[PDB]
Structure formats: structure tokens, C-alpha cells
């Protein structure tokens, strides 16, 4: 999850930039959706 509104699911998922996460979630600096 990132600071802003929209829908992220609370899962494990790997990413390289914001882009690859599912719906408004952010890539945190390690390669993980939040």
C-alpha cells in the first residue's frame, strides 16, 4: 500500500517499479508490493 486512495491487495508480489503492482499499490525499495 502507498499513501494514496484506490484498492491494493494484501499480498506477497514481486515488482520492479510501481507499474508491475496490481491495482494502486506502490513497489517499495526492496521489490515487494505494499
Known amino acids: 500500500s502507498g499513501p ?3 484498492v491494493c491487495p494484501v ?3 514481486l515488482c520492479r517499479r ?3 503492482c496490481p491495482g ?3 513497489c517499495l525499495g526492496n ?3 505494499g
Do not use: P, W
Open 4 to 6: 494514496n486512495g484506490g
Open 11 to 13: 499480498l506477497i508480489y
Open 31 to 33: 521489490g515487494y508490493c
Open 24 to 26: 494502486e499499490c506502490i
Open 18 to 20: 510501481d507499474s508491475d
